[PDB]
Amino acid sequence: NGPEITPEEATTIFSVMVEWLESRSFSPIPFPPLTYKNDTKILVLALEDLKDVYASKVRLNASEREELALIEEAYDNPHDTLNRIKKYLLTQRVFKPVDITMMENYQNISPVYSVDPLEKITDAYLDQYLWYEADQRKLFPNWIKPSDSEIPPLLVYKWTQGINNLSEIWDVSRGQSAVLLETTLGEMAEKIDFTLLNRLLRLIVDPNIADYITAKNNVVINFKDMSHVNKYGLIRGLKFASFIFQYYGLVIDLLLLGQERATDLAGPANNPNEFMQFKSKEVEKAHPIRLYTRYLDRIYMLFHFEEDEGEELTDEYLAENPDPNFENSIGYNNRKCW
Amino acid sequence: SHRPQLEARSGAKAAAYTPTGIEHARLLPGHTTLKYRKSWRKGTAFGRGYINDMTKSEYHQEFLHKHVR
Amino acid sequence: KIPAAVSNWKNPNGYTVALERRVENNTINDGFMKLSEALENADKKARQ
Amino acid sequence: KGGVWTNVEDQILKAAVQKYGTHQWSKVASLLQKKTARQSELRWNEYLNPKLNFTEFSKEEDAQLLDLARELPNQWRTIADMMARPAQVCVERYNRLLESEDSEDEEKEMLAEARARLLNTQGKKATRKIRERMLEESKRIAELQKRRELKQAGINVAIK
Amino acid sequence: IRQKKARTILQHLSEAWRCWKANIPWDVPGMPAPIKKIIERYIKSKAD
Amino acid sequence: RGGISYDQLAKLSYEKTLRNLATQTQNSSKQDKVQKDTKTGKITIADDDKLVNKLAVSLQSESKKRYEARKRQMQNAKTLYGVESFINDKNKQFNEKLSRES
RNA sequence: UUAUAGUUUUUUUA
RNA sequence: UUUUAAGAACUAGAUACUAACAC
RNA sequence: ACGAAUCUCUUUGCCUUUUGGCUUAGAUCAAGUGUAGUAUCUGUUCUUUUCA
RNA sequence: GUAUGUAUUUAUUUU
């Protein structure tokens, strides 16, 4: 059936990210240079990250032992390896297969990928390197937060404090309302589409590295006998498959906000806000949208409404979905706990 | 030495046998008698049966779109 | 006439077999062609 | 530890695949030493398996190539199948196509090992039977020439 | 003609099934069309 | 071309042993009742002790010549073809059945 | 290492 | 009527399979 | 001349010792140690015949 | 560490 997006949508999306960035005035990443000031540190980190998988183990299987070898040398010969990698990214486009085995919850299931050790070691270096250079250059604005500074329950907390202590929501004097959305993105990665990627990454990262990614996805997938090329969606077990993921969702976000309201949340790049901040109350009140927070999948939003605007919406909706039934309260859903 | 069977045991080979006399359980008399019948909102980027088959089905693809997840 | 079984998995007597008894049509959809070249157009506009 | 491929072990492989079939690899790395499942099957599917296409270009394959690989920024195994050509080779002959732009001992002992292994198909039970039966026949022969030598004494001892 | 032809066609049966597990599109190069129908029929049945 | 029905074949063999029988009789010219029992339902036929023995001997020699065609066929057939891999005898046998295929 | 030891999924820290 | 093994002596051990036998 | 028969060989037909199940591919697939029984891998040196 | 399997003829069967 061919590509789904249609070229129309494609162009619109790309342009979006563009005027964001130029407007955001962001400098793209260079490939890790041969002379790098920080470099072996970063590699310290990534390798400890692999090490930690095996910290606990006692029985080590074959691929494992292969690993610990590859590690131990990597400790020994940092300039060796760094050269080996920067080579690998500059060049190699084709990769060993990959292995899914699903692991059980006794209720649901989840895919567990396994990459292959060299590919891993490179990756982990590059994962680490991305996050560091990005957050160094303040790629992501506040409101994308499964982030550093806040462990999850604390995130809940400051999210409440956000809700409340912003100005005025509790004055019901007139009809005044405020409404939260709780959402998923459904499939999110599994529609991530390469040809789109390799461009959107031509934005923010050198054409090579990005190439290393887009060409880093497609693999055979061997589950035992069953095997198939992976032509389309996204394998998350790739060490860096976090980052781009966040990236892609940002694109979603600059839609749901649309430019301006985002420019509220970020403020200037010179003065990116903390989580919950603005300049005047009006900055909140220049728009109905007050909080927007997107955590992995789930999107969480807060609208502040007065009967004017809100009844102009229900003017739209109602106009197109009249229900003399008055049954629109049937399928509607809220909590079974409370 | 695993062989797929090609056959089944004729009742006759049984039939010639003499009886046993063991009494099993489920044969104890029961049901002993029968029965008979008689403004702002413009900001964002967008200006305004049963299919006999399985792994292409609608349900099944929902299901596996939940659980294996 | 029924062919004879050569089965990738079991080989229950050990018999050996010439490989090929053990062992695409379409192209892409031009939706691609349009996709990458449209991405391309907006691209070069933007960089300009 | 870092290895490369002798046509010795390569041949032992293609013999092994030519018996056990593809998807039993964990056996194919038994005969083959020095090597693993994923290693074996990696080189097999990516290189050795004859059903692959090894040949030159053509302008079908070429204009085809720059077509597809220009449309899809890098996805090689997809484009590979699109060419019905092996992965890294399409990659390679591609890069060349833009490079016109410019400005015997213990291996003989392992072969003794596998070459000896293939030739016994049964499993422990059947061999065990071969023995047991022959032992029965020795019993017969013995008991016979027992009776024969007893007939040469004329005393006739009946068989059980 | 039965015995050998039969059993061996069953070997085609199994081979067909454990194809359909592994997703093997299972085209045996040539083979009588109706029999191949039977195989498809049953393997649907066992499939569900 | 081709396969012969098990009918017409049995007829043809009937012809072959016709003409062979004819070389028996005629060649025997070249080199040169039914009783029933009223007592019991048994019937009694009288035949020459001749031509019964020609019969049996003919049969035996047929079994011979066929047996030997099959045997010499063993020898030649198993010595000739040298191509495909063979683990044991039955690989040669069966594998040559897969050659019989196409 | 003992009074055993094929099925009883064999093996991880705060 | 069948048949014909190159023959003899000297040599070390490497890779081996396994062992209700020794932490 | 050709009719008939025996043997020999080639071709075709018929396949003759010619793959006999299922379940999660049934699951799993390497890191040890001394000695000992038994299998077998190579070198060197010498000599090419018959009768009671 | 074991199931499992095998043989255990002594007391003379007529020439």
| Portion in helices of chain B | 10-25%
Helix content of chain F: 55-70%
Number of helices of chain B: 2
- Give the SSE string of chain B: HH
Query: What strand order characterises the main sheet of chain F?
Result: 1-2
Class by helix and strand content of chain B? mainly alpha
State the shape of chain F. elongated
Please give the alpha-carbon distance between the first and last residues of chain F: 16 Å
- How many separate domains make up the residues of chain F? 1
Number of strands of chain B: 0
Indicate the structural class of chain F: mainly alpha
Strand content of chain F: 5-15%
Overall strand count of chain F: 2
Description:
The structure is cut from a larger assembly and holds two copies of chain A, one copy of chain B (69 residues), one copy of chain C (48 residues), one copy of chain D (160 residues) and one copy of chain F (102 residues). Chain A is mostly helical. Chain A is 49% helix and 11% strand. In chain A, helix 1 packs parallel to helix 7 and helix 2 (39-55) runs antiparallel to helix 3 (62-76). Chain A is globular, with a radius of gyration of 23 Å. Chain B is elongated and about 95 Å long. With 69 residues, chain B is mainly alpha-helical. The longest helix of chain B is centred in the C-terminal third of the chain and has 9 residues, at 58-66. Chain C has one helix at residues 31-47. Chain C is rod-shaped. The chains are: A mainly alpha (338), B mainly alpha (69), C mainly alpha (48), D mainly alpha (160), F mainly alpha (102). Chains in contact: A-B, A-C, A-D, A-E, B-E, C-D, C-E, C-F, D-F. At the C-D interface, helix 1 of C face helix 1 and helix 4 of D. Chain F: This is Pre-mRNA-splicing factor SYF2. Chain F: Its main location: nucleus.
How are the elements arranged and paired?
The structure is cut from a larger assembly and holds 2 copies of chain A, 1 copy of chain B (69 residues), 1 copy of chain C (48 residues), 1 copy of chain D (160 residues) and 1 copy of chain F (102 residues).
Chain C: H1 31-47
Chain D: H1 7-20, H2 25-31, H3 37-48, H4 59-71, H5 76-83, H6 87-97, H7 106-117, H8 124-152
Chain F: H1 6-30, E1 34-36, E2 43-45, H2 52-80, H3 89-101
Antiparallel strand pairs in F: 1-2
Chain F binds 4 RNA strands through α1, α2 and α3.
